[PDB]
Design a protein around this ligand. Structure first.
Ligand code: HEC
Ligand code: HEC
Ligand code: HEC
Ligand code: HEC
Ligand code: HEC
Ligand code: HEC
Ligand code: HEC
Ligand code: HEC
Ligand code: HEC
Ligand code: HEC
Ligand code: HEC
Ligand code: HEC
Ligand code: HEC
Ligand code: HEC
Ligand SMILES: [Ca+2]
Ligand SMILES: [Ca+2]
Ligand SMILES: [Ca+2]
Ligand SMILES: [Ca+2]
Ligand code: NA
Ligand code: NA
Lengths: 519, 519, 103, 104
């Protein structure tokens, strides 16, 4: 049984924590619930840590007093199909292999599934660690609670004696790096300096050996990613987001300065010795839009290249951990601002961006966002009980499973079937434009080898490559983004029509140039 | 927001609490969660209370850290028919009015419903308070959460200006007295001396004005009735139970001294002014059989009469708060032990017992009890989750709503339909014997006026009255008991056959005596 | 389910009072032949008959009416309690009169 | 495993059975399915039984060749309430006890 410690003794050396803990709704929650500091207290002074106290990062630290939220979080949605590859005719991007050729996603890109699995799925996907990590057996794929208890309870490492990124299976890649993990876990919150910069006090950084880092990480989506453990107040901890919102002055809602002021973020820094080390962003309100934007954004978390000269941008560069915090129509300018692209297309030779799940930046300016709706309203609503104490569902999932609470509460004019029909009208329409965008991109891509072999000029090829960047961007945003247009239907439409326009321009340019060589 | 208090300061005066709180699983739970003691601390002395601290008795005091258990508890089972009178042909006791004539239950005796409603149902039933208390309107009958929040949030009092028990509606009774409340609430746990004896430190006792007492009570079945709030360990608080098990040395399992020693109870006494005041019973194990036996027993909680001389036994007498702690075949001896009966039958003039829901005493010696099964196994099982932290359901209800967890986990040889069929075999058989017992009781009862009018001797009438006591006991046990024989089918069968045997003997006695007067 | 539960609360309560009203009416009715055979006076029988009119009215309304109290729960309750009150009064009247003839 | 017996040997004494068995749809069904008659055959005479043969009366004697009919037959209808007394207000005869008084 836990025995409480004298928190006032801790506070004599921890004024920063005192000021948070004594004021919030965890003022009565003793430190022993999350820290083992006995040897630390025996050896510390106010200016010397002595022995490092242990901090718990497991989600069960919160589950003894918040079982309802924990159990809701760890639920597995079996209807969210697992390990389902997007580059198939029945999924999101039927022509993904042709369009993404040259990028590591060609090795595997599955649809997302329930949050319990995020860390294990990151570890086992074929594009990440060369097949090094696998589930212990094929039964373990069901075990959400096990994954939450810890990744290494359900996974194996093909070679514990080596720490290099290497292929263990032939058709895998080694795209994982330490920045990835910041959107899978925050077990490393006390071991990673802000942005993953080098720091004397950091165990891990952007330049660490990712296999060694991986072995030190266990839990997915820690509860404290959205809730300060000391104040219990709403926050974010993701460095890249704080960097965009605060450091770069973009605000929480770049398109709305008033909402940015009302629903803002305060950066709080923590020091190691006299030096700034880590940071959090305390939120003015419990704003799920910003909480979820810790991960559901377009980002760099990888090496790349400069647009200017094609030179390598490695993990050591700050650009390897970057939130663009830009909508689709501002993205190209945002990437130009940091002089960055992700990959060169294997067939066309075009410098291209790689887009990541940009739900936050897509939701901006939509009718729902402008009306003050937030991700949680549709994806983790309050539970409705005939008799009971209300709490917030922490099972982040499609509104289809809870339409009464997620949609019909606001849309009293509709039945469930009507609301579903409205979702499907948008998704069906958007998907048709994704497919047509892919048709035209593929048609353009396939002209590059014909043009090259016909002796079309490099000037014309480079003109077509510039068009490819835009055709790609204005398509891939939407295969990357998970709502199939629902989050912003007008934007999806305008973007996808732009993609098709750009591809058609390139097709005409290349066809005319090929025909001139033949003539 | 709550601010923690210095528990060490409290412990300087409260050694018993220190000993419990520092060792159990609430060692980190600060007193401020349940007590507001600022003025108390300013004024108390070593052994005088000074100003009385506030103690929260609402179930929401526990719900902040144990929402899952709270929400389970407050669930309303709508399929548990509400306000359903037992004296009807389609319920438990078709001939109840004839058989119970002379007792207050003739005014109303409904089937039980969900625990959330126990205190409000006690207040509003027609037999209890002369119709003084009513739901504010007929909509409020659904509001389990509201009842839990407090009885007086959903009820009205016909006359706040008077405190006497009287009839406000014509066909009501005033059977309620302070003892009843001990099986509906423990809001009075600090205001009631052990057994309800007179005590200078007690606000309330057996002899209090029950209408005044009622007004001071709010919450049903407090969480702390089974869980010590200081140690978090298992306990009972009901005085009558502690009196039977400990004071009278009968043990937790009176038929099994070994099980009584393994699964025993330790009486802990709290004092006021260095005089014993109140008591709890700490359990060796988390034994739901004994927890549920705080209320689901046969009891006295009322005035009555002496078997020896017919003299009144009032609320002032200790016998007005008594747990017989005896099975059906030991009950007559247990009532003789205290020289007590409940009422005289209105037609026969027989001294009769009144039986109350004797589930605990019925369960003793049954196959399930002998195999170590307990009430919770069938009525509040552990929750089964595909992914989650296990907790114990607190929705005490029929196993029919959860047969997998309540029955089939043990009975792997059965399907759900087979297990239900086994239940129904027993209940159908038992109910048929209840009905036949009633037929014979009624036949006997209806001979008394014929016999009296024919001039049958008092000696013969008294012989028949003695038979009526037994005929009644061996029937009414089973209409009072809620399982319709399932808890102990062989015992129900033997008892009900005994009832019929006694009634038949009385019928023959009376018929022969009437026939002799006619001749 | 909550709305259904509210309906059933009223109907269950009302039905129980209907059944109890019937029990008391039946008990009273069955005393009439005993009283007549015992030589109870017509004056007493007529007093009981007057009570029977009211006992009957305040019961039968509710077996005739199709909502089992739902249409007016407070009225059903007051009426059915009145029926029982009238029958009880008649039962006491007749029992005492029979007992007086026996003595 | 069952071994067939010589039915013609039985029929030499059992003409009624011969007349029935040889003509119907069990003409190919050997006696061993339902009878163990070895000691009977050793001891019987023209019109004295001798040792009594064993005759199976269990329903599984038929279930080997007629499993569908057997399984249908043995089904338990759980909705047919069990051990439900008729002399109750919710069953067939609410006043049965009064009316049948004197009968078992
Ligand atoms: C002064 C005598 C201290 C007492 C009393 C406590 N702590 Fe401490 N702590 C102290 C120092 C100087 C530091 C290092 C600060 C720095 O410059 O880096 C710490 C650090 C911690 C940490 C963080 C450790 C890490 O992983 O970086 C924690 C979680 C911590 N301390 C907790 C803690 C608790 C719970 C205490 C009371 C039981 C406590 N500390 C007392 C100095 C002192
Ligand atoms: C029991 C010892 C607790 C532990 C361990 C954790 N929390 Fe907690 N939390 C606890 C209490 C008593 C309360 C106040 C309840 C009330 O309404 O009075 C809370 C509150 C929260 C909140 C809400 C904060 C707010 O609205 O301002 C959150 C978001 C929360 N707790 C989160 C949380 C986390 C993430 C935990 C693990 C790090 C955690 N709590 C542990 C009690 C206890
Ligand atoms: C009894 C005869 C079994 C049948 C029927 C099914 N499974 Fe099975 N399965 C069984 C065993 C003994 C094992 C190995 C267990 C161990 O830990 O050693 C398994 C394994 C699996 C696996 C893992 C396969 C792997 O290569 O790692 C899966 C995914 C699995 N079983 C699923 C499964 C399905 C869906 C079944 C019905 C079609 C099924 N099994 C039947 C034993 C038996
Ligand atoms: C936050 C800005 C992220 C970074 C950095 C990385 N990932 Fe991610 N990932 C993120 C989200 C919001 C999702 C769910 C939505 C989606 O579109 O999938 C994911 C999902 C994955 C998955 C599962 C699906 C799949 O693509 O197979 C994997 C295997 C995964 N992520 C791996 C991964 C790698 C290897 C990363 C560094 C190169 C990485 N992620 C970074 C959010 C973020
Ligand atoms: C961000 C992605 C979250 C994570 C990770 C966790 N929670 Fe959460 N929580 C989140 C939101 C948006 C809210 C509602 C805020 C609002 O005001 O609308 C909550 C709320 C809570 C609470 C408060 C009580 C309630 O409303 O249910 C608690 C106690 C809580 N959350 C606990 C908790 C736990 C234990 C988590 C890990 C299992 C957890 N939260 C993660 C957002 C996020
Ligand atoms: C209601 C107005 C919504 C708001 C606010 C947000 N989302 Fe959403 N999202 C919504 C719909 C109707 C759908 C399609 C679901 C379907 O079943 O067709 C989605 C989809 C997603 C997904 C993918 C879910 C899945 O396919 O299983 C994700 C990851 C997602 N949404 C994330 C998300 C974020 C982070 C939001 C705030 C920035 C957000 N959504 C808001 C409806 C609504
Ligand atoms: C000595 C000066 C005391 C201090 C310090 C605290 N308490 Fe106390 N308390 C004290 C006495 C003498 C009594 C009467 C009972 C006895 O042990 O003799 C009490 C009583 C209580 C109660 C019961 C109140 C009731 O209604 O019956 C409670 C709940 C209580 N005390 C709580 C309590 C708390 C939480 C304290 C620290 C904040 C505390 N007490 C200090 C004497 C003294
Ligand atoms: C948060 C501040 C709490 C309050 C308020 C209550 N309880 Fe609690 N309880 C709390 C914790 C942190 C724990 C330990 C969890 C673990 O498993 O480590 C408990 C435990 C219990 C238990 C289990 C005890 C045991 O198995 O020995 C019970 C039965 C319990 N708590 C009951 C309970 C009651 C009835 C409360 C209201 C009076 C209550 N708790 C409040 C945290 C908190
Ligand atoms: C709109 C035309 C209504 C319809 C249709 C139903 N109800 Fe109603 N009900 C309505 C009102 C305005 C009120 C009074 C509210 C108040 O607090 O003043 C009610 C009341 C009830 C009650 C309580 C009756 C009592 O005597 O206290 C019940 C039990 C109730 N309503 C139930 C109910 C049912 C089951 C309905 C469908 C058959 C129904 N009501 C319809 C308004 C309207
Ligand atoms: C514990 C030993 C009890 C005493 C003392 C009293 N009651 Fe009770 N009551 C108890 C239980 C376990 C139950 C549920 C099981 C059952 O058979 O009903 C009840 C139920 C009631 C009800 C609801 C059902 C009904 O009879 O209408 C009422 C209205 C009720 N109890 C009232 C009541 C009165 C007036 C009491 C003192 C005379 C009394 N109860 C004492 C347990 C116990
Ligand atoms: C007796 C009738 C009970 C009442 C009143 C409450 N609980 Fe309970 N609780 C009860 C049992 C039989 C058990 C299981 C014991 C076992 O070991 O099998 C529990 C358990 C708990 C726990 C522990 C965690 C769990 O198993 O779920 C907690 C935290 C708990 N109970 C809390 C709790 C609350 C908050 C109550 C009021 C709503 C409550 N309990 C009442 C028996 C009884
Ligand atoms: C399983 C082996 C049981 C044990 C142990 C206990 N009870 Fe039970 N109970 C059981 C059954 C099958 C039934 C009949 C339910 C049905 O739907 O037919 C009951 C019934 C009750 C009831 C009435 C429930 C209702 O009708 O809604 C009560 C109040 C009850 N049981 C209480 C109870 C007690 C207090 C127990 C421990 C002493 C106990 N039961 C054990 C099965 C089992
Ligand atoms: C003449 C020597 C016989 C031979 C060869 C067989 N059986 Fe027979 N059996 C014989 C007699 C005289 C009787 C008594 C009835 C009669 O017809 O007079 C029987 C009786 C049976 C019975 C009935 C047994 C019983 O318990 O009543 C059976 C089932 C029977 N016999 C079967 C049978 C079989 C299968 C034979 C061939 C293996 C067979 N019998 C030969 C005389 C003779
Ligand atoms: C296999 C060795 C059999 C045994 C043992 C039993 N029966 Fe049979 N039966 C068998 C066959 C091959 C047939 C003919 C199928 C066809 O349609 O050609 C039958 C037929 C019957 C019938 C239908 C007869 C008719 O329609 O005239 C019945 C009613 C029947 N069998 C019943 C039956 C009984 C009751 C058995 C146990 C005493 C039994 N059979 C055994 C093959 C076999
Ligand atoms: Ca999905
Ligand atoms: Ca990107
Ligand atoms: Ca019930
Ligand atoms: Ca009793
Ligand atoms: Na602000
Ligand atoms: Na409600």
């Amino acid at each position: 049984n836990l025995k409480p410690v004298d928190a006032m003794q801790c506070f004599d050396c921890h004024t920063q924590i005192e000021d948070m803990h004594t004021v919030g709704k965890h003022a009565t929650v003793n430190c022993v619930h999350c820290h083992d500091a006995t040897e630390h207290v025996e050896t510390a002074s106010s200016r010397r840590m002595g022995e490092r106290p242990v901090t718990r990062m497991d989600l069960e630290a919160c589950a003894t007093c918040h079982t309802a939220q924990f159990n809701s979080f760890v639920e597995v949605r079996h209807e969210s199909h697992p390990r389902l590859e997007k580059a198939t005719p029945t999924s999101r991007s039927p022509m993904f292999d042709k369009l993404i050729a040259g990028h590591g996603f060609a090795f595997e890109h599955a649809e997302p599934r329930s949050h319990a699995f995020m860390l294990v799925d990151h570890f086992v996907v074929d594009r990440a660690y060369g097949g090094r990590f696998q589930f212990k057996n094929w039964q373990k794929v069901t075990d959400g609670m096990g994954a939450v208890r810890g990744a290494w309870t359900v996974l194996t490492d093909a070679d514990p004696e080596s720490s290099d990124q290497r292929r263990f299976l032939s058709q895998t890649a080694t795209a994982a790096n330490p920045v990835c993990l910041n959107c899978k876990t925050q077990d490393h919150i006390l071991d990673w300096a802000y942005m993953g910069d080098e720091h004397e006090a950091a165990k891990w950084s952007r330049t660490s050996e990712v296999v060694e880092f991986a072995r030190d990480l266990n839990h997915p989506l820690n509860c404290f990613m959205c809730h300060d453990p000391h104040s219990a107040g709403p926050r974010v901890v993701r460095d890249g987001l704080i960097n965009a919102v605060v450091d770069r002055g973009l605000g929480t809602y770049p398109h709305d300065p008033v909402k940015s002021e009302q629903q803002g973020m305060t950066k709080v820094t923590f020091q190691r010795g006299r030096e700034d080390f880590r940071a959090i962003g305390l939120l003015d309100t419990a704003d799920s839009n910003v909480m979820c934007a810790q991960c559901h954004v377009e980002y760099n978390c990888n090496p790349g290249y400069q647009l200017s000269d094609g030179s390598r941008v490695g993990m050591d560069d700050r650009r390897a951990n970057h939130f663009f915090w830009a909508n689709v129509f501002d993205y190209k300018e945002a990437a130009q601002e940091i002089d960055f692209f992700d990959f060169r297309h294997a067939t066309t030779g075009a410098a291209l961006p790689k887009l990541q799940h940009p739900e936050a930046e897509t939701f901006w300016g939509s009718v729902h966002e402008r009306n003050g709706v937030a991700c949680a309203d549709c994806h983790m609503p309050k539970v409705q009980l005939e008799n009971g104490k209300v709490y917030t569902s922490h099972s982040q999932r499609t509104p289809r499973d809870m339409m009464g609470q997620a949609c019909l509460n606001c849309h009293a004019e509709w039945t469930e079937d009507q609301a579903l029909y409205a979702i499907d009208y948008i998704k069906n329409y958007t998907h048709g434009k994704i497919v047509k965008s892919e048709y035209w991109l593929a048609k353009m891509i396939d002209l590059f080898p014909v043009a090259k072999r016909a002796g079309v000029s490099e000037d014309v090829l480079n003109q077509a490559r510039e068009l490819h960047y835009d055709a790609h961007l204005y398509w891939e945003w939407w295969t990357a983004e998970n709502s199939v247009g629902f989050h912003n239907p007008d934007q999806a439409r305008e973007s996808l029509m732009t993609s098709i326009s750009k591809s058609k321009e390139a097709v005409s340019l290349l066809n005319d140039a090929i025909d001139a060589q033949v003539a």
